[PDB]
Amino acid sequence: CRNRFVKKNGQCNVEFTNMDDKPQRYIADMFTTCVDIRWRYMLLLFSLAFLVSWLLFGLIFWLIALIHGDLENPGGDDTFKPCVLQVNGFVAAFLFSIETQTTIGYGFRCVTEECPLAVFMVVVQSIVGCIIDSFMIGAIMAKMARPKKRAQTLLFSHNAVVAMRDGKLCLMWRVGNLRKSHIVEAHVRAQLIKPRITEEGEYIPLDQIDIDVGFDKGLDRIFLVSPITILHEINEDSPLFGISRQDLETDDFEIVVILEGMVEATAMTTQARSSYLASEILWGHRFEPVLFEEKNQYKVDYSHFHKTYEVPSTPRCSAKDLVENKFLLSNS
Amino acid sequence: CRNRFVKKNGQCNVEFTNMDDKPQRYIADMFTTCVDIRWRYMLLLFSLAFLVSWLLFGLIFWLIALIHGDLENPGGDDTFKPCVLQVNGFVAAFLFSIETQTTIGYGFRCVTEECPLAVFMVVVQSIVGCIIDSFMIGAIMAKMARPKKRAQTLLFSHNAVVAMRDGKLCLMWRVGNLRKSHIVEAHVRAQLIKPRITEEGEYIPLDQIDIDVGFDKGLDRIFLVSPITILHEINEDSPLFGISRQDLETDDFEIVVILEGMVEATAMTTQARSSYLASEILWGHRFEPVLFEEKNQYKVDYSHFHKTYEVPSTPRCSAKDLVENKFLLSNS
Amino acid sequence: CRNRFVKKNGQCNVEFTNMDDKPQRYIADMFTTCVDIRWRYMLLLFSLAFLVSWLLFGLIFWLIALIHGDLENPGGDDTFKPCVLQVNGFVAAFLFSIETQTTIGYGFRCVTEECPLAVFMVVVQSIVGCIIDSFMIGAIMAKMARPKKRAQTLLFSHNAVVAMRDGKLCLMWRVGNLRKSHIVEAHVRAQLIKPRITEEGEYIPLDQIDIDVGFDKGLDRIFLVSPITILHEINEDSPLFGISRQDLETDDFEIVVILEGMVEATAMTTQARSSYLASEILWGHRFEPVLFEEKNQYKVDYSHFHKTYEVPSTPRCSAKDLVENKFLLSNS
Amino acid sequence: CRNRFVKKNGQCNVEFTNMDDKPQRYIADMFTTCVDIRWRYMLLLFSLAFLVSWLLFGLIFWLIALIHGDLENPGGDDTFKPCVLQVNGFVAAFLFSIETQTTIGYGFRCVTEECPLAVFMVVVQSIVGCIIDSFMIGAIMAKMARPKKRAQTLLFSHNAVVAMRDGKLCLMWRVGNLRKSHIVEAHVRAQLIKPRITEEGEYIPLDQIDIDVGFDKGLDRIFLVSPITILHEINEDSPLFGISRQDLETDDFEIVVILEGMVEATAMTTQARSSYLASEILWGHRFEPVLFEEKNQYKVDYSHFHKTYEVPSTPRCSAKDLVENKFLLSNS
Ligand SMILES: [K+]
Ligand SMILES: [K+]
Ligand SMILES: [K+]
Ligand SMILES: [K+]
């Protein structure tokens, strides 16, 4: 009866455990994780970094002010010039650190030509400042631009159907584009998922078996404007070959459907997924047409996308029987 | 007689309606939309964000100035130090907010060490400032760099022709590069569009049928320097197999041509398209050569690109007849 | 005798003329051109933009200062507050414009709360400022990162050779990686270039004919660490099938070799090219091995890369003859 | 006995020498190198650039201050206005240079309307400033984002095994994903590495021979969630065809395994590698299942990933013998 390996939203149902090296391997790939975490976390993270550099330098400057004796003479006089003007304490040293690294530079607190170490520190802090910004930009740039978001404007039919097209019995499901932007170099893939035991007695917890959508003839490549109906012809080499309408309400297995393509604007490949259980496949049905001609253009009614209608003319046996039977009649 | 599913510019003629979830699905993919809108909109949008953060913080600062009693003593004295110097009112609080977030920091209005909340607010606003900038950069970066713009320096012939090459009857159309930059890993695809009814009585509003350009042999991949003429050999497995010159002025259908490749500079796939109606296909014609040798290099005259000439030697029947007839003569 | 369509550096020898729409099509694709121009031009271009916005706003501010009467009272007094402090003339108005847009904000020239138009202008200029920066970043980012630069660390043999390998006569040329960085998902392509006339009497100025490197079997995909020798087996379906050693010093044609792959760091496809004329192909030679085992690793001597040695055992006739002859001996 | 061409981490064991043009070819591709060097080097490099521009301009400003006579009158008076206020010497000129290029602009040192050359210099320095930043961003952006880092969250089995599946003798190794992020458009490749001599007596130091993973049928493409076991069927066309269990402890050769795919977030192809020596291949073993059903989802125990168990039922001869023998029994 259960269960489902890929959910309908495409989300995969599985978890990794006892991975061992996970910590040290994630440090090297660390950038990859950083961009998948919630915004608030990536942000708080960066503000944490800012805050830390501001405090660090602030301390240096305050230390410098303390030792130089600026805390007691922040503004100096004819006989005395402070390292950095107007640093009277911690908060003052803090403010100056921020003003410097942010490049606001109000100027009320200001470096003088006196201390080479203060000057140096400012130099270092400036450079540092650029570095952190650069990381933030890249991170934000990257995360903002993730192509997996496009998979949410792509659509699969809630069900898959089996039915005759041009003398052949075919498993079909539908796909559609919810944006007027194109999916470039798009193509599809399908797989039958279920556990099995090889004739040698080897148990495969879940075997993934290719469902042929026409890859060989280059037919898995699609041009997607209006919703396309995807066809798997069930034949000798099909994993569904010996399955009939009654085997559908009995058998336990899963079909996984994939759509890969490039977001038109960024040319970044996105991968959309969904799944049909044997109990989500409608035998003897056909998809309702979503496309019609309004005279000087075409329109797509998306409310008909998921809808199917009964075709009582449809055979209830397997392709296998269907074929075999043909060769009794034709054989006699 | 009508109509056309893809226009000649490649623009697709169709519209989506009754999409349902459109709003909630567009929010998750929201970045994808943001980059396709007109510049002025993306910009005004960002300036809207800036303006909003400036006003927001300005209010905070003004509120802080008001309560602290700075509005009445903006410059302070020996006994009194304001939260932020020189904020006498709304506009002053506004100016300071901008100066801070932009990092101009003229310094006439300046934070003091007095209020931790003012200090904090400045901290927050600074961080915020970086965040908005980062988004703007990414957005601008992205939109500026869109690869679909390259499709406008790529070219299709205004017409397609049918004619004999090396003993075979072929549908041909032409493609060309208008930049001296290359289209990397380029390849082509073709499809016949028209409504049809399966032998089972199923209506397909528009069926998309592959036109073989040599995909199987890897011949759909092209190296495009000078204009290339693309050939579809019309044979047993061709959708045009049973079509003759007279069927061209009668029949209603459409041929869709695609060119996919990578912009040399960004290596981002662009997809160019165009279309030929049965009435835009010239039977019995041939393309005028645009390439000639000037002795130590080659030149392309692009004014000859679209031009075709009559070949009266050309057969007016279908490949089907042509073949079948060959097997009467050779059969007798 | 001449000439060469692709030079040895990969540079293509051809020019486009009479393109017509070139100007209006380049405006839409305008970004693509901007990144291919020399640095100095892209830079001067941007500094031109900066300079133009600084001058524009400077004028506005100066106009505002003039009308308000600030030019005569730049510092104001108890009874008079200028729009922007310390603007006494053109250069002053200019300096302030720059200080504002650059966010330096020394603060000597500073906006006051008086003029909403000055304030507004500052607002506008700030926003504008960000916009130009963003473009510069993207442009610089893009151009700096162009993948076509990697093609200069990729290498082709100065000559191609023909010779026997495992009982088959093969055209071979060599390729090599000059960086320890990998070329990801790399593959090769070859083509024979030369003008020809179809049996129908149609002249093709230059026909491009695929040279099979094993694409069908997936053998055109290579893993390139040490230099690889690329093999074209000359057989029935080869365009070189009927060519012998003597036809090489006579015939005029060209072979074009391509290597496509992804720069490991940016995963951006680069395309490297080179060319062999019939007179650059060495019949009866073999490449000198550049790889040898030094015991706990391997080394590549690149000075042997281009070198070839004579194999007098090599047949001087065409594959065609070679085959045909085999079937006399075996036929008698 | 030795040695290994690709290490187990994927690192390649080889070195390039006598490359000749290496310096001039690396200058054109210079960006590619810059991003592979250690952070500290790329950073120090950039800080070097900053420091150099600060010093350069500082000198100009100091020169200008010197000649104008500002060094003796940094603050000016009613009758005298300095080029740049408050530059009394070298360090002062330095500080101002930094303040300007960084856009901090404290304002204590400030340009006046007096010198057009000082003004000009500031203009130039500002523009320059933007330029360097832009490069730093791009560099940091790029390097931070390198897709080769993802290959460290991808996994190969420590050993490869040979064993029967569904009546066929197969070489198998395992692959797994250590992140819950997907590897998009992933596919695999395998190759047998070893030196050989063609029947013509030509020595190939290392020949790379394709191991068929199902490329022809499109089966080399995988959907990787849980660890997949990769199968090479050993048959007539297999390079391992004539190899038996005893040939494994004798022969010296290497098998190289590759996994190519796209980092889900950036859609940038990464290439992962590893290697199995004839002595790292376990004949007669089978992989321990890492996947099991916990009722409403699936889990992967990664500690079982590398583990194999003995299958005494396994034949010790080559596929060749195995086949040939079948045709004695069936032949008699
Ligand atoms: K500033
Ligand atoms: K200032
Ligand atoms: K600033
Ligand atoms: K400032």
Domains of chain C (ranges, CATH numbers): 1-14+147-332 (2.60.40.1400), 15-146 (1.10.287.70)
Cβ atoms within 10 A of the Cβ of B26, count?
Answer: 16
The upper half-sphere exposure of residue A160, i.e. CA atoms within 13 Å in the direction of its Cβ, equals 23
Helix residue ranges per DSSP H, chain D: 22-28, 30-34, 39-68, 90-102, 116-144, 245-248, 319-329
**Residues contacting residue C329 through CB under 8 Å, at least 6 positions apart:** none
Residue to test with chain B: of A297, A307, A313, most B Cβ within 10 A = A297
Question: From CA C79, how far away is CA C331, in angstroms rounded?
Answer: 118
Taking CA atoms, D33 is separated from A169, C149, C181, C249, D29, in Å, by 56, 11, 9, 43, 7
Residue written as tokens 């583990």? D307
Chains with ≥3 CB–CB distances under 8 Å to C: A, B, D
Exposed, middle or buried: residue A51 (CB in 10 Å: 0-12, 13-18, 19+)?
middle
Q: Do D271 and C264 touch (CB under 8 A)?
A: yes
Residue written as tokens 């022969």? D251
Question: From CA C65, how far away is CA A224, in angstroms rounded?
Answer: 60
Taking CA atoms, B89 is separated from B59, B74, B118, C102, in Å, by 10, 9, 16, 27
Phi, psi angle pair for A157, to nearest 5°: -70, 145
Least CB–CB distance from B260: residue in A47, A184, A301: A184
Question: From CA C92, how far away is CA C71, in angstroms rounded?
Answer: 10
The token pair at A179 is 């944006």
Question: From CA A108, how far away is CA D143, in angstroms rounded?
Answer: 38
Q: What DSSP designation does A289 have?
A: P
**Torsion sign across C-alpha atoms C58, C40, C127, A96:** negative
Question: From CA A101, how far away is CA A141, in angstroms rounded?
Answer: 22
User: Rg of chain A's alpha carbons, rounded to an integer?
Assistant: 33
Question: From CA C52, how far away is CA C157, in angstroms rounded?
Answer: 51
Question: From CA D98, how far away is CA D90, in angstroms rounded?
Answer: 12
How far D217 CA lies from chain A's nearest CA (Å)? 7
CB burial readout C71-90, b (16+ within 10 A) else e: beebeeeeeebbbbbbbbeb
How far C106 CA lies from chain A's nearest CA (Å)? 8
Q: How far apart are the first and last CA of chain D?
A: 42
**Residues contacting residue B55 through CB under 8 Å, at least 6 positions apart:** B94, B97
Question: From CA B328, how far away is CA B319, in angstroms rounded?
Answer: 14
Contacts with C92 from chain D: Cβ below 8 Å:
113
- Report the amino acid identity of residue C159: N
**Residues contacting residue C19 through CB under 8 Å, at least 6 positions apart:** B178, B302
Q: Do A140 and B141 touch (CB under 8 A)?
A: no
A13 within 8 A of D298, measured Cβ to Cβ: yes
Query: 3-state DSSP call for residue B150?
Result: helix
- DSSP code per residue over D216-248: GGTTTB---SS-EEEEEE--TT-TTTT--HHHH
The token pair at D154 is 């991808």
Query: If we measure between CA atoms, which residue out of A36, A195, A151, A144 comes closest to residue D180?
Result: A36
Question: From CA C13, how far away is CA B298, in angstroms rounded?
Answer: 6
How far D68 CA lies from chain B's nearest CA (Å)? 27
Phi, psi angle pair for D96, to nearest 5°: -60, -40
Query: If we measure between CA atoms, which residue out of A178, A225, A182, A264 comes closest to residue B5?
Result: A225
Q: Do A107 and C103 touch (CB under 8 A)?
A: no
Contacts with A262 from chain D: Cβ below 8 Å:
267
Query: If we measure between CA atoms, which residue out of C246, C258, C239, C244 comes closest to residue C194?
Result: C239
Which ligand has the nearest atom to the CA of C102? 3
β-pair partners for D12:
D6
Phi, psi angle pair for A209, to nearest 5°: -120, 125
Exposed, middle or buried: residue C332 (CB in 10 Å: 0-12, 13-18, 19+)?
exposed
Q: At what angle do helices B39-68 and B90-102 cross, to 10 degrees?
A: 120
C180 within 8 A of C168, measured Cβ to Cβ: no
| Residue contacts between B and D (CB atoms, under 8 Å) | 7
- The alpha carbon torsion through B37, B38, B43, B45 (nearest 10 deg) reads -40
Residue to test with chain B: of C202, C254, C255, most B Cβ within 10 A = C202
The upper half-sphere exposure of residue D317, i.e. CA atoms within 13 Å in the direction of its Cβ, equals 8
C92 within 8 A of C61, measured Cβ to Cβ: no
Query: If we measure between CA atoms, which residue out of D269, D306, D300, D262 comes closest to residue D288?
Result: D306
Exposed, middle or buried: residue D33 (CB in 10 Å: 0-12, 13-18, 19+)?
middle
Cβ atoms within 10 A of the Cβ of C37, count?
Answer: 12
Cβ atoms within 10 A of the Cβ of C251, count?
Answer: 14
How far D227 CA lies from chain C's nearest CA (Å)? 22
Question: From CA B63, how far away is CA A218, in angstroms rounded?
Answer: 67
Question: From CA A224, how far away is CA A216, in angstroms rounded?
Answer: 19
β-pair partners for A163:
A170
3-state percent breakdown (helix, strand, coil) of chain D, nearest 5: 35, 30, 40
Question: From CA D125, how far away is CA D319, in angstroms rounded?
Answer: 73
Question: From CA D143, how far away is CA D137, in angstroms rounded?
Answer: 10
- DSSP code per residue over D313-325: TS--S-HHHHHHH
Question: From CA B135, how far away is CA B43, in angstroms rounded?
Answer: 12
Residue to test with chain B: of A50, A61, A94, A152, most B Cβ within 10 A = A152
Cβ atoms within 10 A of the Cβ of A103, count?
Answer: 21
How far B107 CA lies from chain D's nearest CA (Å)? 8
Residue D104 assigned as binding residue = yes
CB burial readout D93-105, b (16+ within 10 A) else e: bbbbbbbbbbbbb
Residue written as tokens 């379906």? C237
Q: What DSSP designation does A21 have?
A: S
Question: From CA A144, how far away is CA A35, in angstroms rounded?
Answer: 9
D210 → chain C, closest CA residue: C219
- DSSP code per residue over C91-114: HHHHHHHHHHHHT---SSSEE-SS
Query: 3-state DSSP call for residue C318?
Result: coil
Question: From CA A3, how far away is CA D294, in angstroms rounded?
Answer: 9
Residue A105 assigned as binding residue = yes
- The alpha carbon torsion through A130, A135, A137, A140 (nearest 10 deg) reads -160
Question: From CA C47, how far away is CA D126, in angstroms rounded?
Answer: 10
Q: Do B134 and A141 touch (CB under 8 A)?
A: yes
Phi, psi angle pair for B281, to nearest 5°: -90, 125
Q: Are strands D308-310 and D285-287 parallel, antiparallel or unpaired?
A: antiparallel
B36: left (phi over 0), alpha (psi -120 to 50) or beta: alpha
The upper half-sphere exposure of residue A68, i.e. CA atoms within 13 Å in the direction of its Cβ, equals 27
Query: If we measure between CA atoms, which residue out of D204, B81, B155 comes closest to residue A92?
Result: B81
Question: From CA D215, how far away is CA D192, in angstroms rounded?
Answer: 16
B118 within 8 A of C118, measured Cβ to Cβ: no
Taking CA atoms, A78 is separated from A73, A81, D78, D241, D246, in Å, by 12, 8, 22, 94, 94
**Torsion sign across C-alpha atoms B68, B71, B73, B75:** positive
The upper half-sphere exposure of residue C50, i.e. CA atoms within 13 Å in the direction of its Cβ, equals 26
How far C304 CA lies from chain B's nearest CA (Å)? 31
The token pair at D212 is 């068929």
Resolution in Å, one decimal, please. 3.3
**Residues contacting residue B155 through CB under 8 Å, at least 6 positions apart:** B175, B176, B177, B178, B227, B305
D218 within 8 A of D239, measured Cβ to Cβ: no
Query: 3-state DSSP call for residue C225?
Result: coil
Least CB–CB distance from C218: residue in D146, D147, D215: D215
Summarize the annotated binding site of C as residue ranges: 38, 40, 103-106, 143, 148
Residue written as tokens 């000016």? D76
Least CB–CB distance from D15: residue in C152, C153, C300: C300
Cβ atoms within 10 A of the Cβ of A292, count?
Answer: 12
Contacts with B100 from chain A: Cβ below 8 Å:
104
Q: Do B107 and C107 touch (CB under 8 A)?
A: yes
Taking CA atoms, A236 is separated from A161, A233, A239, A241, B5, in Å, by 19, 10, 8, 6, 37
- Report the amino acid identity of residue A37: I
Phi, psi angle pair for A224, to nearest 5°: -105, 110
Q: Which residues precede a break in chain D, with C-to-N distance above 2.5 Å?
A: none
The token pair at B231 is 């050939």
Contacts with C162 from chain D: Cβ below 8 Å:
none
Contacts with C203 from chain B: Cβ below 8 Å:
289
Question: From CA D264, how far away is CA D269, in angstroms rounded?
Answer: 9
Ligand 3 center to D98 CA (angstroms): 12
The DSSP element (H or E) to which B171 belongs, if any, is strand B168-177
Question: From CA D140, how far away is CA D133, in angstroms rounded?
Answer: 10
Q: What DSSP designation does C64 have?
A: H
Q: What DSSP designation does C227 have?
A: -
What's the gap between Cα A13 and its chain centre?
15
Q: Which residues precede a break in chain B, with C-to-N distance above 2.5 Å?
A: none
User: Is the N-terminal amide bond of B3 cis, ω within 30° of 0?
Assistant: yes
Which ligand has the nearest atom to the CA of B102? 3
- Report the amino acid identity of residue B210: D
The token pair at B10 is 């490649």
User: Is the N-terminal amide bond of C3 cis, ω within 30° of 0?
Assistant: yes
Residue A104 assigned as binding residue = yes
**Torsion sign across C-alpha atoms C19, C23, C29, C35:** positive
Residue A106 assigned as binding residue = yes
Phi, psi angle pair for C207, to nearest 5°: -95, 135
Report the residue count for chain C: 332
- The alpha carbon torsion through A298, A302, A304, A307 (nearest 10 deg) reads 140
- Report the amino acid identity of residue D69: G
Phi, psi angle pair for A19, to nearest 5°: -70, -5
**Residues contacting residue B300 through CB under 8 Å, at least 6 positions apart:** B176, B226, B227, B290, B291, C14, C15, C16, C17
Residues within 5 Å of ion ligand 4, judged at the Cβ atom: A 105; B 105; C 105; D 105
Contacts with C88 from chain D: Cβ below 8 Å:
113
β-pair partners for D290:
none
